[PDB]
Structure 1
Amino acid sequence: AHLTLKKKVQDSRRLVAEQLLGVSEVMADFSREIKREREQHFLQEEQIIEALQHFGIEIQHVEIYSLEQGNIDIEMTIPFSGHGESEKIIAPMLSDILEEQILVKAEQHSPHPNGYSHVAFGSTKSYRVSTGAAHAAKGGGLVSGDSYSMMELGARKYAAAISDGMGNGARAHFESNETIKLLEKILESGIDEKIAIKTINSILSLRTTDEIYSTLDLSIIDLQDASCKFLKVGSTPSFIKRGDQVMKVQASNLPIGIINEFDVEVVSEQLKAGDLLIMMSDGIFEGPKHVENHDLWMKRKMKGLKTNDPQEIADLLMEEVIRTRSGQIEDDMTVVVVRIDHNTP
């Protein structure tokens, strides 16, 4: 409730600049963070070659292909020698990485007095992951307004994202499918997840509307110690099932765009082997039209599930929401399940 100020084109021009300066800040903040990751691995590489010279080990042949904390892969070649010397030179190799355990793969191919022993070292992963999902559209036809994806990023972590958006058929998929495709590439870079969401949230800021773009739900399970990073930027609830318990995780923040200041909060939970992480969109959680308490209804539905296969769990919950109606589907429905259990190699 102010004056007129009808010469407002300049006020819009300089305001759009701050939108372009704001996103340029998170891009520069992303550039210095990835450069910091380049300097750590480079410093780790220098520290590794000095440690070899000092310890009584032979530098007959060496090749370093890549050195990420998740995907550790280096190759060496040393004289044949004898006994457990191929692995007791690895004890300092674990300590030089300071964080990761290293295993040995020794390929000795020289049935002659001359020494030709080629060896490769790789990272170790714990907790094997099993996946499965169920998909459904509002009209049950062709393409749904909800999009999901779940891919593994090397050895360390398994990712799972779900995006919603608008309710229209074509108007919501092209906007929801693009979010996951943009997230599927930014998460592949190996950047901090809390920063990766601000970077996606900044790029997708368009028109300065309310609830502009695709809401999203990201869950990343670290295989190092079976920890999870619950990132909710779509305000969609998620659940964890351990035997017969059902623990609900939720977070306060608004959809993707520039709807909130001071970005997105992270939520962490600790799980063990045999646990079941199920996620759904708003079409399943608010699916049944004749239900008041959607939290108790979703908890009791899982306690009746008597299986550990993640594929069946996604379907028995999906069709149970359909059972509450006369086969009706009043909204786009999507559910993703992930199970955790050790490798036991």
Structure 2
Amino acid sequence: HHHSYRVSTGAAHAAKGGGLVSGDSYSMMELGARKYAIAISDGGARAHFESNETIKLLEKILESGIDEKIAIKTINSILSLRTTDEIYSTLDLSIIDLQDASCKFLKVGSTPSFIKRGDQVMKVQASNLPIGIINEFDVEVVSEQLKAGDLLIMMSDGIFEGPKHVENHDLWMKRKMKGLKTNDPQEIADLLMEEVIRTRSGQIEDDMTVVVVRIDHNTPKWASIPVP
């Protein structure tokens, strides 16, 4: 009934041309008992109902205990159905188990997620499943074991691709995450945003969005620290 881990979260979001409403969507929600779920998507009132619904489906498959290849082709089937061509939407989705700190990620697109553990910053990525096996949406499904203190950073394509005069976007983000010293999720969100906006001198070509989640021990409020 009491969870061993807890989550602290932050989020920054900007719109095209310094606008007031963005078309990036994100959500971070408890998802039943012991899980916690983070999602970002790019690509209407009814639209965000259909999205949340497909996200719910993808959630349940991700959590089903199914082999990763099967999940991949199942998810492709789901997406082919209830999607058209001429819709090129992206989705990064991560779900943390709040008892063991295990985590399942699912990626559709070319925008990378990252874990920061101390001074390492790992890009979370899956292999191309072998040739001859089709993958219509280049869906990726990765499982990692997290530890307390870990940062998880997820971003929209607009912010990943945002830094001007920068050829390797992956490596630029990597560096900028390495260079942070704060462990605050929200400070980290806002800092990353400012670094890419600084690079384009204030102009905002796309909706830009990043969420950060720190993973902590769920230590009761009344606890005191112990000493050496």
Q: TM-score range by the shorter chain?
A: 0.7 to 0.9
Report what 1:149 is aligned to.
27
CA contact (8 A) 2:91 2:109 kept: yes
Distance 1:295 1:203, change over 3 A: closer
1:263 and 1:310 map into 2 onto residues whose CA distance is: 29
Q: What whole-Å deviation, never above 9, does each CA across 1:201-238 have from its counterpart, x for those lacking one?
A: 54543698646342211111112211111211233201
Per-residue deviation, 1:253: 7.2
CA contact (8 A) 1:233 1:254 kept: no
Report the RMSD for the aligned CA atoms in angstroms.
Answer: 4.5
1:341 and 1:273 map into 2 onto residues whose CA distance is: 5
Task: Tell me the SS of whatever aligns to 2:82.
Answer: coil
2:185 and 2:129 map into 1 onto residues whose CA distance is: 29
Per-residue deviation, 1:160: 0.4
Q: What whole-Å deviation, never above 9, does each CA across 1:282-310 have from its counterpart, x for those lacking one?
A: 11111112101222211121122111111
Unaligned runs of 5+ in 1: 1-125
Q: Which has the higher strand share?
A: 2
1:321 and 1:255 map into 2 onto residues whose CA distance is: 36
Task: Tell me the SS of whatever aligns to 2:52.
Answer: helix
**Percent of aligned pairs sharing the same letter:** 99
CA contact (8 A) 1:151 1:158 kept: yes
2:39 and 2:130 map into 1 onto residues whose CA distance is: 14
Distance 1:173 1:339, change over 3 A: same
TM-score by length of 2: 0.75
Per-residue deviation, 1:334: 0.8
1:339 and 1:191 map into 2 onto residues whose CA distance is: 27
Q: What whole-Å deviation, never above 9, does each CA across 1:84-120 have from its counterpart, x for those lacking one?
A: xxxxxxxxxxxxxxxxxxxxxxxxxxxxxxxxxxxxx
Per-residue deviation, 1:264: 4.0
CA contact (8 A) 2:37 2:93 kept: yes
Q: Which has the higher helix share?
A: 1
1:172 and 1:229 map into 2 onto residues whose CA distance is: 25
CA contact (8 A) 1:179 1:214 kept: no
Larger radius of gyration: 1
Bigger mean CA deviation after superposition, 279-288 or 263-272:
263-272
1:258 and 1:174 map into 2 onto residues whose CA distance is: 31
CA contact (8 A) 1:205 1:256 kept: no
Task: Tell me the SS of whatever aligns to 2:94.
Answer: strand
2:115 and 2:152 map into 1 onto residues whose CA distance is: 5
1:262 and 1:334 map into 2 onto residues whose CA distance is: 22
Task: Tell me the SS of whatever aligns to 1:204.
Answer: helix
Task: Tell me the SS of whatever aligns to 2:99.
Answer: coil
Distance 1:208 1:163, change over 3 A: closer
Per-residue deviation, 1:197: 7.4
CA contact (8 A) 1:144 1:173 kept: no
Unaligned runs of 5+ in 2: 220-227
Per-residue deviation, 1:184: 7.7
2:212 and 2:38 map into 1 onto residues whose CA distance is: 9
Per-residue deviation, 1:265: 4.2
Task: Tell me the SS of whatever aligns to 1:132.
Answer: strand
CA contact (8 A) 2:148 2:215 kept: yes
Match of 2:150 among 256, 272, 275: 275
Q: What whole-Å deviation, never above 9, does each CA across 1:229-264 have from its counterpart, x for those lacking one?
A: 121123320111112211111246799999835984
Per-residue deviation, 1:196: 7.6
CA contact (8 A) 2:18 2:203 kept: no
TM-score by length of 1: 0.52
Per-residue deviation, 1:333: 0.7
Per-residue deviation, 1:143: 2.7
Q: What whole-Å deviation, never above 9, does each CA across 1:104-141 have from its counterpart, x for those lacking one?
A: xxxxxxxxxxxxxxxxxxxxxx1111111111112332
Relative contact order (alpha carbons < 8 A, sep ≥ 6): 1 or 2 greater?
2
Q: What whole-Å deviation, never above 9, does each CA across 1:23-43 have from its counterpart, x for those lacking one?
A: xxxxxxxxxxxxxxxxxxxxx
CA contact (8 A) 2:76 2:139 kept: no
1:170 and 1:278 map into 2 onto residues whose CA distance is: 27
Report what 1:187 is aligned to.
62
